[PDB]
Structure formats: C-alpha cells, structure tokens
Symmetry: D2
Subunit: 386 residues, 4 copies
C-alpha cells in the first residue's frame, strides 16, 4: 500500500492548465456557461463551482488531502480550529439535546461549551472521560453527542476513544474527537469508531506557525454535508491563500511528525530524570497514567506536553531564561514554544473547571519543535541551573 | 471636515518598520517578553498581541478603516458576510428571544434565520419591513432584535430604517442593518438609529471580486466586545492576506462607488425606457416605491438592481448574449455581473417566502460595474435587439 | 471604439476552471502530457507552458493588459522598472554600438547608462533631448538607439518624441521611451514613433504602493521576442503574486489617472500663485517650457512634479510639517508623496549631470494622490503659512 | 545542527510577531529630511525602497548567508538573475572567462550569446581536469565559473584545486551549487569567492517559487553584486521571500531524505538490465566520486541515466504513475525529463557533443516520497 508521504505529495485531481503546483484561486465568484448550467450547479447537477463560500478549488484540494489521511467520507476546512469545533457540534446539537464533553479541553472549547451552547438550550456536562464508567453514568435519554480531546490540552489526560465509541454506537450518540494534539499521522479517530475527527490546522498540520485554520472530517457523506451546510451559513471559511499554505505545510507533515515525536520523547525523559522537575505529563512515558491506552490507540505521539516545577517562581525563572525556546502560546510549530497555562492559555477557564482540570501555577507547557534535540535539551539545562 | 477619500488613504496608527504599505502579518502567534507581559495581555492590560484569532495587526488595520467610515465604537472582520451576520445576531439572541427580520433577504440569511436560529430556541418572524405598522404588529414582549436589509437583495425593496429604529429604541430591541447593497459611502445605518451595521465585504467594499469576507460595526464598545467574544469561539476570521486585499480594495471605494452609482442610474434609465423591459426596480428611480425613503435616508445608491423581462425565455436570451456583462452570481465588482435570481441566488428560498419576496422567472438582476457606461448600454442594447 | 476602462476590465483569454478572477499560478514548473508535447513546446510548437521563467499564466495576463493599452505587438513584465530598462536596452546594444540618452533621467537609469553600459563596450552620450538639433549633432555612424524619458523625472523636462522618432527611423536607430511619469492612459509612445514603450509598474500602473515591477512593450513581434530572450537569461521576473496585484491595480488605472491628473493640475496652480513658491515645473501649466509639445503629444498629465522654494530651509520646513502628504521616495501611489531630490532620489547622480539636470537644494518633488484635492491643498497651505 | 540555525535566525521580531511579516510594500517613510538624506548616504539604520532593500527579502538573505558562511547574500527573481549578477557585476569588455563545458541550458545561453556581445571572451572547457583549466588560462582571465556536479550529467570538478589556481593567478571563482544545496556543498569553504543557487530548486523545495541567491566571501564583492542588482533589477518579491524562508525551515530534513532516496534509486537503476549506466556522484562507479566525496558532505538527488534507445526512454518516461514528466528539479515530489529534447535542446550543437548529451539519456530528480513507492513506479514502467 502506497505510503502516506507519497499520498500527500500526489493528491487526486487534474492539474489546472498543466500547472505543477495547484493554483491559488483568489476569487469570490465563478462564471456560468449558460443559465441552465448555473441553474444545474445550484441544484447540485454537473461538476463545477459557483462561489467561494460554497466551494473553492484550492480549499477543496486541501480538504481532499486531509480526507485521504483520515479515511473519511469528506472533509471541510475552516478559518480556525474554533470554526471546525463550532461547526462539528452546533451543526448537530439543538435545543433540548445533551452533550457530554471531556473536562480538560482547549481554553476556547471550554468557553464555547460553557457560555454559548447553554444559551442555545443545549445541556452540557463536562466529565472525566478517562473513565468510560463515568461517561456511562453521565448519560441521559437526550444525550446526542460525546466530545473528546485525547491527549487533552494541556495536561495530556488520555481517554479510551475506542470504548467510548462503543457506548456511543450502542446508545445512538455521535462521537466527535479533536485530534489536534497528535496529528492524523498518529491518531485517526474514525478508525477507532468516532463519527467526526477534527483539528486546529493552525498547529501540526500546517506546522509553520503562519496560518490559523481548522478542518473537520466525517465518517458519513450525510454528516460532512450537514457540516458544510452549517459552514455555508456560519461562515468560517479557509482563505484560498491559507489553503495554499496549509496544503504546502502538509507536504512535510509525516517527516515533521516523526521528528516532533522523537524529539518530544527525548526532551520529556530528560526532564523526568532532572532533579528540579516534579513530574512530566507526556503520554508516551511509562510513568504516565493511560500510557497503555495511548500506545494501543495511537501510532505515535505529538510533542506538546506539560511538566511540574517545585514553585511558580521556579517556573517563571525557567520560562524567562530560555534562549532557543520562545515564550508564546500555540503549539505544533517547527520551532519550540513554551507557555504558562494557569495565566495564559487556561486563565479564562471557570475556577470549578480549573480545579477539575488539575492546572496549577507550577505547571509549564512545552511544544517541542524539530530543532536538533540537543539544542533544546541544552537550552533547558542551561536555564534549570541558576 | 476631511473627505472620506482622504480618511481611507490616511488611516490612524504608526507605520511598522517605516513601511508605507501596512505589512501582511501572516502569523499564527506572537511572542511575549516575560511571563507578566503575557499574563497581562490575557487580562487585557497593556498593549500588544497574543494570537491571530484574538487579534491580528493586518486585520485590525482593515477594521479601523471600516470603523472610521461607519462612525462606530469598533468593527470586527470575518471570513465572510455570513460570518458577520451570524456573529451579529447569535452573539446576542438566546433561547426564548424573538427576532423580527425582513421578508426579502439575501438567501443564506434566510437559511440562517429559518433553519439554524429556531434549532437554538430563538423565535423568528419574517415580516414586510417596508411597512412600520407591520413591524409593530409582529412585536412581542420578548422581541430583542430587528434585522433589516435595505434596499433588499435582490428586489431593492426599501425599509424605513429611521422609523423602525425609533420603535427598537423605545422597546429595548437592537437594530441590525446589512448595508451590503449600498456600501458605507452611501448608507450609514449608525447615523439612522441602528445599533449594528454590517457588510459582505466580498461585494463593494473590497470591490475586486477576489476575496470573501465580512465586517460588522457597533455603536457601543460593549456590543463590539460581545461580537468579538462570539467570533473568538465561533471562529469566522478574516485571513491576513484577505485583510491586506480588502484594505487595498477599500482605498478606491469612494471613487468606485461614485462611478457605480452614476453608471447604475444610467443603465436603469436606459432599461426603463426600453420596449423589451416591463419594469425596473432601482431605488433611485422616481417610479420606484420607497424612492422617497431611500433618497432621504441614503446619500447615494448602489448599482445592483433587478428588472422584469416579458418572459423567462426573453430573460435567458438577454443573459446569454452579452459580451461585456458576465453571467455569474455575486455583486459589487469593478466589472458588470448578471444573474437569474429565480433559478440561481434565490432558488434555495422556500416558496412561501419566494412568493412574498416577489421573485419570478421573468426577473434579471444586474450588478453594474465601472466600465464606460456607453459600452455597458451598447452590450445590453445589442442583445435586446437580437434576431 | 470600446473605452480603455472597459478593455482593462475585460482582458482577452479564457477563464481558468470558470474562475471569475484570474488565478495566481504560484508554481515554478508545468507538467507535460508526453515526451513529444514537451519537445514541441521547447521548439515553440503548440500551445502551453513549460516553466515560469519562460512564461507564467498570471504574469502573461498582466502582460496582455499592458499590451492592449500600448497598442503593441507584445509586452514583457519584469521584477522592476530597472529590469524593464536593462532588458529594453542591453537586449539590443552590443560592444561598438552608441546610445544617445536624455540628460535628465531617473537616477538608477543614469547609473545603468554611465556605470554598466561603458563596461560592456557600449558608447553613451547623455544629451539635452528637449532640442532635436542637439540629438542630431550627437549622432554617429554607429548610433543604434535613442532613449528618452518625457516628462523627465524629476524636472518634467519635455522632449519632442515625434521629432526625434523621425531621425531614428531615417537612420536605423531604435527609439525607446520610458513613459512611467505619465502612464499609458495619457502617453502612448508607440503612437508617436517609438519602437519600445516601458514603465516602472511600481508607480502609476499598479498604483497602490505595494509592488515593485516593470513592463516593456515593443512595436514588433521580433523585438518583444528579443526582449523576452534577454529576460530568460538576465532573470528579472515579475512574481505571480505581484502580477496578480499589478493586474488588480490596473483595473482602476483609468479612473485613478483621471483623478491624479485633475488633482495635480489644481495643486500646481495653487502652488504657482503662492507667495512662498518661486516656480512650478508641471508640464500642464502654460508657463512651462515645452507645455506646447506635451499638450500635442500626450492626452493628459501625470501628477508628479517639482516646485522651487526660496531656500533649502523653507523646503525642509514645508516637507516636515505635512499631515496628509507622506515624506518618502517613489510616486504614482493613491496617496500623496513628497521628497527632496537633491538629498534623496537624485543625490547619487554625478555632480556634472546634477547641474546639467537643474536640481538644486530649493527643489521639492510632489506626487499628488487621489485624496480630495481641497484636503491636499489645505495641508500644503497650513505648512506654508507656518509661524 | 543546521536546522536549529535556520529556525532561529538573528534579528528582532516585528511587533512581537512570531512569523516574520511580509512587507508587501514598494516604499518606506522618513521621519525627517535629515533621516532620509542619511539613509541615502548609508548612515543610520532603516529602509528606503524595496529594490534597495526589503525586510522580508533581507531575512531570507541572512538565512542563506548564515549557511554559506558568507560576508553577505543577495536574493534575486531567479537563478538566472543570480548568475548574470555574479558574473556581469565583475566581468567587462576585454576580460576573459573560463566556464565549465557542461552547464544549465540558460547559463550556456548567457555565456555564449550575451557575454561576447559585451566584449567578454569566453571559453567553455572541461573543468574536471585542473590542467585543462591551467592550459586555457590567459593574461586577461578574470573568472572561472563552475557547476559541480554539473547539470545534467553530474560531471564533477575539483573546486578546491581550481580555487588554488584562481587565488594564485588573480581570478574570481564562482560556483553554482544548485544541484547539491548549501547543506552538502559550501563553495566558500573550499576557496570559492562566490557561491550561488537557483532557489527555485532545493532551497525553496516546494515547486512554487522562482528565485535566486548569490553569497560572497568578501563585503566588497556582495556590495558590488547588490549594486549591479539595483540597476539590472532581478529582485525577489516579498511574498516569494516569505515562501523561500518558509521552505528553507525544512531544508536540512528534506536534503537528508533526498540524499538517501536518490542513492537508493540510483543503485536500483544501476543493477537493472534495462539501464546502460547511472551518473550519480555518490556511486562507486562514477568518475570523480572520490573528489565529490572529499569536497561535499552529501549529494543531491538529481541525476542522469542511460537507456538502450530513445524508444526505451520515451516508453519509461510516458508510463510513470507517481513521477511527473516536467523540467525543473529539487522539489518535494519526483520529476523526470529528457535533456536532449527539453532542458538542453537549445545548447549549440558543438557544446552538446562536448557535454555527451544523447537521445538515450533521462534525468530524474528524486523527491521525498517513500523510496519503495518511487522504485515500484520505475519498476512497472521499465518492465511493462
């Protein structure tokens, strides 16, 4: 079977005007041959384009790429991971429905589920999804969806996607998984029985820290059609230039991910054995709870994770004396990023959810890039002594 | 008072590295100087950026330009007009609230209001907003918003923005106006009593047919903050390259709108006097109902409007034999576009709403560009006079 | 005949995948159907592309637009005006050949002609081309080219393009004309007898101050092929993104030029009557030498020109106290620029050429944009009236 | 290693932006007349006009400069811009140039058509032999220009040995290292004066930009190159510089894969019955392997092999399902072409025999796809 590297470098589709690189269709609208041809396209008859919000060829080329790696029925690209998340949940959930979500989620995902969904009459329970029994107990007659992040941002908490997918299939709910932290090279939720797999493309998939985007991929034709129907009216679109840059970034995704993985594990083991570090939450470490689940259900690991210092002062000292690592939010870029979740990425999480997430001022989140690991380790080593 | 032409060419703000054009910040994140500086920006203390979804300098430059012409407290840019429309309605409306909206709206706006809003427990009525008495009769104790498009896409139906705004103001409802069809050069809903003014920037503001985007501007700091809070979580963003292009397109907005307006009126008059043409729905014509309101409440007219042929077959023969006009949907581009609403832009509108909207197979919509008007008229004339 | 506004908005060519805007072909190479199809394209047989340096579809689109306004056999786009100038001169001149060029030329053109051409065994005289008799007197048996800028940058000195072309045609010399300062809306050198017309597209053609580029257009198929042969090996290319932006800027070129022309004449007239201003060098003024030639050979004027203050100190005081005008080099942008030739654009021109050129510390060059003209005049007036 | 350096270039962030912004501008504003006057005289820090200097372009120049160990680098609108700028910035009427006899097609066009019109004497000679360089030497020889391994035959020149001759005799050595990338070949480190690349190939690597770069050992030489550029006008667009800097972030990792893939493919081809001979500089069989191994730290993945006939070549080139028939090289995906009727079709008949280019030769540029997939594509097209 042809390798993913080869697949991403040779996507399906004809060349445009014999061009080797796929052109950037920086256009709003498309021309019709005749009234009938235009009318037919609006009814979904024949092949062609109408208007970029409905479909843009450069964006569609990127969608096909992601669809190929996910093994999906189709994919939809968005202006951001939040666009993909909004569009993969609110396209399905309506007043009177109930959502079960992980209690440790990306910051704006918490804002979405906690502030906006309940204004739309949607009941939401944030619960510890690392325990399938806790999902079963939280179930109600109107439960229509389970939403998971595994490993969770930022603590890397691992959930049993496969076992939860079984409960979802049995009980008639959709399973939506945000695989942003791991990339589709290593985590393919649709293979584990999820209905929807989504990513902040802003992170690993693009990988170059120069685009914000989102993608969502559905197991069924009907579901991706619904997501794109929601997208048409909600309006979170990937720009043609950004789609050009995301497809270009994804051409190196497999090699980048192999390096990220190996680099991140090397850094996590260095940190785990260092006298100043209390613990390291990398799902690929033997000591991490749910390592057994993450090794069985994934084929590799992302390189973003958190570790615990002895005090806030210690963390501040480390974060502020690094020469190679950059103090910034976001993750999955080619270069190494570091941040303080308590006062940056997860500062807006309500205090009750803060507690349940286990985030404290002593935690530091690092996103290991594709630099020579020895440079990242020497940078950290450098800083840790002072 | 400085002319808008000058204002748009001289936006406030320092240059970046002395660059004359404002740079394209094609970046996802921003660097912090220290833990405290980062922590503070997250609390909204100090000046600086964090992450492009929360704020991107190139996008913010474009927002300030729109804010300047609307006379707003702030503006928010989006990945599309639909992003602006969603974010300007659903950032405020919640389960149990009631919305009154016009019965003749842009198709995807109907789709949003009739399919998605009710799934969120929001009650919606589509009402003929050209009659303020019908707006009042549809009012309920839980009415929280009125949403208007005037002149309406595609029929150019005019609503009394100023009169409806009085009722909104007396009763605690927000008034939202989509002014896409006219541009902020000629219609400034915030001067007429609206709380929010929005546009599909995809149309006139950008003007060059090469970007999809949206913008919404609010009369108060609180309302623009809420819109941007919704945007953070809903995720309809204008990309940095698109913002660079929209700001660039907007540098010629005032002169383009002048030419559009004058061309559009001349093409409407030509059509109104032509034997093949039954009726012309351009709000600048004296024959048009509500011309008196449009003339009082706007300082000019867009150049997109609809006209009635004697038959579907006559409309098709006209649309398919033009050499200057391009058969395509969308509007507000420098070049002239033409389409058939009944089978194209409005073919997705439920027929209960299509009959009330007044859309029939005899209607053709044209979006007059900035070509020499005599060449546009000669194109139309040669097709209308075909064997 | 169809208006140039309309022509530029409707360039010849098929749409690509029905796209309304012409796509950006951000590609280095193109795929071949077969060995034969590739071999044929290399032999110039059949239709298609090979590699962006030889030809890029987005760049070709922009070349077609310029070719249509110049009335040329073909046009070639470059990475800069200087790429165009180098490629329109060195594609033809060889060791032992002689060039006559104007004595008042854009600074880097002076650099090219005085530093690089002589190194290649090409003989160069810089001559006052406002006098045909001086051109004739400088002619030699080996004269192969005359190169003119009219009106000259920055003094606006006018040369008789038509009269000099007669001499070139009689004696077998190519006439090359840099029409940057005027734009092809108002100066069409190929109609006046030139063999090659070129521009810095960085200035008016693009108009938006965000691209550096050049274009050259030839009267004959042979000459444009020779220019592109030189380009292939010298390598000054317009990038696909830049070509997209240039074609986009050019969609508004005719209306921009109308406003530039009118604004520039009104600013020159205001300056001419102002007590602080010694002289105004705008070729549209009746007081200007060679106004008569410029009015017969052009159909309008650019809006970049020079004026004389009473002292260097007065020039600095004016330049540093403007709120609309921006202190910067370059010209032909939608917004108004101002600079000091003696210490900036023309500070590298060898001293003997500086006195021949007439550039002194009292001179200020203004490039009038498309802002409201009363706002520009009021900005100048308040600075001139300072304490 | 090299990856860390490319990911952490020197300079301040602009407005705290993590990615370096795209300065899509033609001009820059001045704070005062004095500040503008000073900048024109080279006094103070700042920018004037994008042709003289653009911040996004400069960031890409600094990246390449860092890897070449140069005094400075200049970016261009194409490889040809870098080439014409690194030769004609120095050579003048009456000077003599010695160039390798096998070069990129357009380089042959530049040297044989344009340079002699400018009164510059040019001899193309076999630079794989240092003695032949010494024998072609004249009192007015001012430059040797090399491409090693050469395009398309991979013919290898002794850069180090020729540099010694050049230093001794007062000539500049200019080296086009396009085929190898600055990860593996650093001509300034072998004694060359100027090292240049078509950035369109490996450095960008993503098949979506045309661009050039030239790096000089001395501050004076890069100043001269940029002075020529100011007037000749081959510039890198700010968007292209943004794309080139971005591509270069994966350059070291892409090169490792290209190198390994290229060698595996060469070896497969070398033992295949259908293949007469493989010209890859990393093979034991190739003439000048010993020099390329001493003078380079790796190899590019573009190389040539010989089929038994034209018909056999046409058959192979037209039945590939993964490899794309196209000119150019050094892209992330595999390209294949026929030099005799494509890249090198315009080379003067005299020079092409001297190059040994025949209808039986095919050139492949091996991408970063899984090698087994590339090999299986070649296998089916050779055997079916």
């Amino acid at each position: 079977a042809q390798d993913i590297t080869t697949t991403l470098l040779h996507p399906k589709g004809d060349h445009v005007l014999h061009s080797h690189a796929y052109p950037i269709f920086q256009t709003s609208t498309f021309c019709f041959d005749s009234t009938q041809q235009g009318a037919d396209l609006f009814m979904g008859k024949g092949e062609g384009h109408i208007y970029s919000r409905l479909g843009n060829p450069t964006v569609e080329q990127f969608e096909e790429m992601v669809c190929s790696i996910e093994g999906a029925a189709g994919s939809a690209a968005f202006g951001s991971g939040m666009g993909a998340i909004s569009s993969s949940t609110l396209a399905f959930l309506q007043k009177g429905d109930h959502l079960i979500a992980g209690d440790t989620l990306y910051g704006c995902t918490v804002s979405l589920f906690t502030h906006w969904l309940p204004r739309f009459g949607i009941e939401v329970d944030l619960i510890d999804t690392s325990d399938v029994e806790k999902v079963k107990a939280a179930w109600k007659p109107n439960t229509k969806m389970v939403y998971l992040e595994s490993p969770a941002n930022p603590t890397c908490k691992v959930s049993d996607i496969k076992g939860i997918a079984v409960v979802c299939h049995e009980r008639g709910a959709r399973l939506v998984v945000d695989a942003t932290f791991t990339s589709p090279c290593f985590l393919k939720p649709l293979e584990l029985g999820a209905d929807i797999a989504l990513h902040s493309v802003s992170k690993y998939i693009n990988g170059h820290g120069d685009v914000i985007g989102g993608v969502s991929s559905a197991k069924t034709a009907e579901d991706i059609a619904t997501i794109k129907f929601y997208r048409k009216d909600a309006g979170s679109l990937m720009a043609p230039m950004d789609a050009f840059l995301c497809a270009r970034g994804m051409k190196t995704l497999p090699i980048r991910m192999q390096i990220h993985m190996e680099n991140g594990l090397k850094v996590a083991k260095f940190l785990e054995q260092h006298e100043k570090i209390v613990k390291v939450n990398h799902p690929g470490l033997e000591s991490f709870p749910g390592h057994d689940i993450a090794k069985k259900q994934m084929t590799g690991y992302g390189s973003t994770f958190l570790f615990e210092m002895k005090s806030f002062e210690a963390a501040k000292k480390l974060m502020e004396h690094l020469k190679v690592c950059t103090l910034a939010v976001s993750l999955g870029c080619v270069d190494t990023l570091i941040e303080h979740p308590a006062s940056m990425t997860h500062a807006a999480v309500p205090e009750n959810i803060m507690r349940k997430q286990g985030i404290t001022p002593e935690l530091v989140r690092i996103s290991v890039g594709i630099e020579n690991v020895d440079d990242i380790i020497a940078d950290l080593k450098q800083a840790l002594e002072l």
